[PDB]
Amino acid sequence: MNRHYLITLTPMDWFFFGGERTLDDGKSADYISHSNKFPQQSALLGMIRYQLLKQHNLLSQFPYTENKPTEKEIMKTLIGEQSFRMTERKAKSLGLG
RNA sequence: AUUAAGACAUUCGUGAGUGAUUUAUUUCCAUGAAGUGGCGU
Numbered sequence: 291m292n293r294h295y296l297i298t299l300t301p302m303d304w305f306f307f308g309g310e311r312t313l314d315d316g317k318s319a320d321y322i323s324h325s326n327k328f329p330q331q332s333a334l335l336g337m338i339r340y341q342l343l344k345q346h347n348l349l350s351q352f353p354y355t356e357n358k359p360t361e362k363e364i365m366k367t368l369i370g371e372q373s374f375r376m377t378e379r380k381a382k383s384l385g386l387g
Numbered sequence: 388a389u390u391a392a393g394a395c396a397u398u399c400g401u402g403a404g405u406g407a408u409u410u411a412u413u414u415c416c417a418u419g420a421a422g423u424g425g426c427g428u
Binding site: 311 | 390
């Protein structure tokens with residue numbers, strides 16, 4: 291009913307985890323891009339959602355579509371209807387699928 | 388779907404320009420074209 295897994299990630303090559311991308315904003319990029327030693331938990335959650343959408347073959351491919359609202363419902367109940375945001379940081383549930 | 392995706396440390400570039408294997412050095416030093424007469428007593 292509620293199965294728990296342990297997921298181990300083995301780096302097969304050199305990895306790069308993004309930073310602030312800038313000490314300011316506007317249009318500037320950073321000439322030196324530094325790698326965080328750890329990814330954000332948002333990255334882990336998005337990886338889980340993407341892999342779940344890969345197992346159940348419901349992926350967003352090539353320009354743009356509307357994804358067959360029944361498929362929209364199944365994707366909502368699989369991965370949730372929304373990404374990780376800190377607006378719902380006090381919500382009692384993860385809000386995902 | 389995850390501070391994400393795309394991005395050759397690459398383009399142009401003669402190991403080239405000036406440079407006498409030249410300067411100094413006697414094929415020279417020593418050396419007899421010389422030696423001897425013979426026989427007919």
